[PDB]
Amino acid sequence: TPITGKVTAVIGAIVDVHFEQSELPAILNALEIKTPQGKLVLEVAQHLGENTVRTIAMDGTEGLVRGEKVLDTGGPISVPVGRETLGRIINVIGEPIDERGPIKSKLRKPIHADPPSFAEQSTSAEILETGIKVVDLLAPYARGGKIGLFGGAGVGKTVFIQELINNIAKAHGGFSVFTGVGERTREGNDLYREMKETGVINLEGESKVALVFGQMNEPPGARARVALTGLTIAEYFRDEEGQDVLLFIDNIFRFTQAGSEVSALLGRIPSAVGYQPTLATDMGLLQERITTTKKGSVTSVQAVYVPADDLTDPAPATTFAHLDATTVLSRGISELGIYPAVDPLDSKSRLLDAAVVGQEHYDVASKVQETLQTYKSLQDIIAILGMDELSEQDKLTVERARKIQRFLSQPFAVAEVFTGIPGKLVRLKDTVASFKAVLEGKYDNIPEHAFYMVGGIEDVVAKAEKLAA
């Protein structure tokens, strides 16, 4: 005989269930309600006292009535794990949503697990090449580390996510998880299609990638939890299969946002800018799970929304802590036509050390930054008074930096519909040598526009002549 009770309160996502027995379901437990069409999952978040528990719903709570029967499942929300998920689109509560029936899995893990201990940690300093000049040169990604893609609305987070899944995820020869958190359903649908066409999912064959979705149409509870589901399937390959997993999450911001939507109704006094007081531990309890143990590795790239173009908004502000590599997409840049809109100074990598990348590699990027900071340090002198009021040194380092800034913009394979240009994938060794040459003054006479939207150094000259006659 299972453990059952009665709904006593419903306010938005929040459901108050009272039990009439001695045993009360543990925090994090899944509880069920049989609905007219399906089943509503609730998750225990707190024990209120007097035998009532407060829960967050996983789906809309219209139609619920007080007194209604509620079943305790006996454990936390569980999802299918193992190779059984690859090729399949999975819901937040572990259900298939690709109309291909059941997922007969070997096991079903709970989405809430404790993150790997400190002595369970295993560290390294390996560059993950991307074929993307900006990242490779100035702020390179960590193999088996966490990577963040910061941007306001429409500066190109998701496109940048795609190019990476396109560059690294096929080539990878590991397994990958894509978890769409509080983003467009249209995009999940688009992704699904593109995977099928790239062979990364073979419906009537085998596949490299499981998909989990909790899109922006889904209620707060779903958008809060779906990130951990995709994470759970990710961990299972790392620990049991000892594999190197790639976890792509667009958008990780939507997770905190979701938490804020319920936080009031959980009776928490609001924090700075109306966020949950639990914002930083909530983020840790997820992020600390995404990491490289001794048993296997996880490399994750996550798009991060930035409300009202505010990098000091609590949500993305708190994230910077968890990231080995950050690439930050500036609206200002994207509005000058420079795609990707990576801020060449504001973007940071743990791996930009001379003894991980080579002193030769280190020196180039350093001086690029020096140059770009000097052009930045003059921006306003120019904007007001023009080039005419600058000392001849300055005037030169501006002519060079203007080329450098366009040289970091690159045609993306996945952005072909917007560029109108074929996509290039420059090599890390190529990127360094190219920019070293430009620093050495070898291409001062060349038109600036020849640097716009190209591959490596040879493409500049190749296009420079196209601009000749």
Partner: protein, 486 residues
């Protein structure tokens, strides 16, 4: 007294009425009060129910009766609404009798999942040269129209709804695009005048007007776009197409902030409730192109957002930008300079348009989108003067010519076939000679000429949708032919 189906008012104020009883009532179930005023039960607590009123506080006394409805907040949906003007709940206000109800749908519904959707390919033809060329919209796409106060935002929505008359006078349901226009917080007189203008173009007959105006209860304003979505959806779930215009979502948000704050929910950024992003998300997700298996019916949304001082980095603007499939952004600067529509090409994008665009347009529009943003940048460094260039001075002529060409009188939505000839004359450069004060003339002069002379092309563009090299060189000739005579 039947505390299971009935309630008693405990208190009322701030648009909320707390009610004892109503035991079996559902969450978000509609209610009817003694006065007649309806309400919605939003908070189900042990001992009482929090209920948000769809009318004036005045019409609820303590003690009064509260009748259950047995219904989640819903609308009358279906084709019997075409041509009518309704408030937020479905009740008619154009005085034209009861609504011919095909049936009823919930105000709040989940947007269709990942699978039952199909990528957009069918063009939504606006009739606006600037839109249909540079930011083309597709059936199922959601396109934000964003800008400052009085920038021709509604104008762009209105010309689109008029333009649909073309396809709405024929048998083809697949070609027809029924229209839903949502008036949230506007002046009552404005809507009156707007509905009248639809009637003066025989467009009312294929469109539904949802209106919760400026004096109406905030919950009626927050609700309107959601019930409207349901009305739009009936055409979607029935293999037909529909366009829903949300005018505007700013005022909706402000109303939903009013609702939230008076409910005691924590003020966040700009004192907006936490779930204001989700407020718009779940609405705007409801517009999608359905799959082959699901009858291929579509809902195509155009939400309107009003920015202050042209700040697109504001909270609600960026929010809605993060939902929609792109934004047509109108500069006040260009609008005040007489360039209407005032589409900023730099800050405007259709994210799925190049695949929805009429294949013939795409071909003649070659890098015009990318060109104009380059020209307007060149014309910025054109501050001198004592340094008059010979090189890019020709793109400065093209620019001013193409700028002139895209300008459009309001209520002049041209057919897609009347568009490509004009754009062909611009892009390729058969306009670099013609004076800037006679391009509007060149337009009417060149349409009449083609309509009489080369009608065979204008009919082939309309029916092929493409341009064969034989029809491209045919257009070419007729262009230089008309150039020699002006």
């Amino acid at each position: 007294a039947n505390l299971n189906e009935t309630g008693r008012v405990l208190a009322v104020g701030d648009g909320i009425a707390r009610v004892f009883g109503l035991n079996n009532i559902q969450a978000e179930e509609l209610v009817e009060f003694s006065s007649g005023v309806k309400g919605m039960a939003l908070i189900l607590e042990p001992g009482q129910v929090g209920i948000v009123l769809f009318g004036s506080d005045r019409l609820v006394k303590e003690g009064e009766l509260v009748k259950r409805t047995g219904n989640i907040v819903d609308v009358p949906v279906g084709p019997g609404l075409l041509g009518r003007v309704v408030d937020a709940l479905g009740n008619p206000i154009d005085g034209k009798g009861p609504i011919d109800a095909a049936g009823r749908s919930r105000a709040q519904v989940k947007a269709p999942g990942i699978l039952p959707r199909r990528s957009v390919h069918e063009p939504v033809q606006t009739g606006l040269k600037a839109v249909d060329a540079l930011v083309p919209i597709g059936r199922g796409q959601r396109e934000l129209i964003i800008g400052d106060r009085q920038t021709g935002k509604t104008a762009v929505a209105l010309d689109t709804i008029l333009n649909q008359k073309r396809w709405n006078n024929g048998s083809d349901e697949s070609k027809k695009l029924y229209c839903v226009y949502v008036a949230v917080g506007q002046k009552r007189s404005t809507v009156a005048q707007l509905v009248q203008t639809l009637e003066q173009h025989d467009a009312m007959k294929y469109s539904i007007i949802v209106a919760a105006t400026a004096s109406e209860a905030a919950p009626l304003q927050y609700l309107a776009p959601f019930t409207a979505a349901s009305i739009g959806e009936w055409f979607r779930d029935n293999g037909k197409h529909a366009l829903i215009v949300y005018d505007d979502l700013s005022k909706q948000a402000v109303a939903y902030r009013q609702l939230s704050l008076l409910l005691r929910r924590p003020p966040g950024r700009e004192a907006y409730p936490g779930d204001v992003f989700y407020l718009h998300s779940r609405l705007l997700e409801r517009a999608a192109k359905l799959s082959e298996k699901e009858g291929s019916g579509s809902l195509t949304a155009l939400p309107v957002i009003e920015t202050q001082g042209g700040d697109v980095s504001a909270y609600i603007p960026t929010n809605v930008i993060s939902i929609t499939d792109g934004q047509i952004f109108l500069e006040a600067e260009l609008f005040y300079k007489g360039i209407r529509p005032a589409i900023n090409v730099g800050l405007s994008v259709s994210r799925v348009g190049s695949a929805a665009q009429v294949k013939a347009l795409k071909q003649v529009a070659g890098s015009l989108k990318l060109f104009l943003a380059q020209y307007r940048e060149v014309a910025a460094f054109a501050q001198f003067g004592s340094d008059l260039d010979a090189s890019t001075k020709q793109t400065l002529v093209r620019g001013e010519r193409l700028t002139q060409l895209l300008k459009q009188n309001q209520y002049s939505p041209l057919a897609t076939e009347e568009q490509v000839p004009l754009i062909y004359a611009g892009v390729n450069g058969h306009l670099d000679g013609i004076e800037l004060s006679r391009i509007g003339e060149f337009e009417s002069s060149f349409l009449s000429y083609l309509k009489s002379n080369h009608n065979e092309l204008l009919t082939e563009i309309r029916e092929k949708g493409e341009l064969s090299k034989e029809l491209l060189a045919s257009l070419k000739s007729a262009t230089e032919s008309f150039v020699a005579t002006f």
